[PDB]
Amino acid sequence: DKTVRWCAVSEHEATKCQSFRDHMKSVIPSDGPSVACVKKASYLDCIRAIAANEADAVTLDAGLVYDAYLAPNNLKPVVAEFYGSKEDPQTFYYAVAVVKKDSGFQMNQLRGKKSCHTGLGRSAGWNIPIGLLYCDLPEPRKPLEKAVANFFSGSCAPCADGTDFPQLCQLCPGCGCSTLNQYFGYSGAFKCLKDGAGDVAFVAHSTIFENLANKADRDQYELLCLDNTRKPVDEYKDCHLAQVPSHTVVARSMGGKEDLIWELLNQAQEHFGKDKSKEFQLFSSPHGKDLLFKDSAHGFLKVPPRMDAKMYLGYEYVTAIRNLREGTC
Ligand SMILES: [Fe+3]
Ligand SMILES: [K+]
Incomplete structure (x- = not known):
């Protein structure tokens, strides 16, 4: 057929x-x-x-x-x-860390904060941010889910096991792995931040624009840059965690x-x-x-x-995932 x-x-x-x-x-x-x-x-x-x-x-x-x-x-x-346009196709997107303006913290001050993730194992929502914060996580760093739960003061990591890692579902009880969980995925991780459950949303560069139609509203949010500074959400190209391959x-x-x-x-x-x-x-x-x-x-x-x-994703992203699971400090 x-x-x-x-x-x-x-x-x-x-x-x-x-x-x-x-x-x-x-x-x-x-x-x-x-x-x-x-x-x-x-x-x-x-x-x-x-x-x-x-x-x-x-x-x-x-x-x-x-x-x-x-x-x-x-x-x-x-x-x-x-993404981008048919004229100039982009086979990647930017992983960013969205936060509310005037919240007074940088990337190096995420310990003790509340986090909203798109889902366990996802590029922007997990692999990239957790990979960058890896050594900041308290020992024992394995299992990773628990070290992350210990680092933040409550989070929402959809698809995580709420029985083994309770705090990873503190912002979304059950850690539902679908849209049934209102805080799942890109739009869900952002809603988790907007509603006030979290202090940071690990999402893509386009998520805020897709969920907040007004510029005046977006101006009340910012991005955490890798150099421990903050920049407007429109400046994601100069303030992102990493570029990741397409879905x-x-x-x-x-x-x-x-x-x-x-x-x-x-x-x-x-x-x-x-x-x-x-x-x-x-x-x-x-x-x-x-x-x-x-x-x-x-x-x-x-x-x-x-x-x-492996070949499709590229050595860099594959190495990023392998360093996360295997690497140490
Ligand atoms: Fe993604
Ligand atoms: K904790």
Whole structure:
């Protein structure tokens, strides 16, 4: 057949996935690619389902793309999101640390503060910030989740085990690993800061602009720069923690339908990409932000043939993840 089983994480994404399915059906000849929706409680279940031949595709943050490639799943990156514009595609985005203006603390004064993370293992929300703060964390630094919980005075790290690490869910009881948790992901980590639960939100450079439409409102927030200074949210290019690779669609290595997945997404971006349709949009939704794909994405780029997560992500980001897990001071 020609159906790509897409893995939607929870109700909000499932809704957008069904709309994705219906709209594609309304414009695609019965000759082209179709989309079926498989709903899961977490991205972890999506990875398992795909390896088990129960689903075919799911978009993951780069940190999770790395995790998906590890045994026994061994998933491969097949289609990447790109940002910026079609004219000059960016296969990366900036990891930033958003804070409220006048809160009186720098990067080197994060100990004792409250943190809002997009999710455990994610680029901007975990890998990058925790990697930079690693040696500041109290010993024993392993397990990492506990050292981080001990460092801050309460946090929200979605997908973390609230039984083993209670304080990592102090700002979002249960540490839900989906949009059901209002403090999950980019928009959720930011809401965690805006509502007053946290002192810092580890998100992407575009998150505040996507969740705060007014400039006067944004002026009440700032970014923590690596040199222990603060700068306006519009100056993320000169005040970020690191550049990280795009969120990417992964699939099985064997019988993964990578060709159909690309065919589906390439046709999907033409019909429902940025500014393409008044009926449906792949990169936004009335049901929420960053559902299925990031709202900041402008399109898709095909990953070279047979490329694995390690080669795709690049030695630098891979080394960043390995240093986090293995490294010391
Ligand atoms: Fe991300
Ligand atoms: K603590």
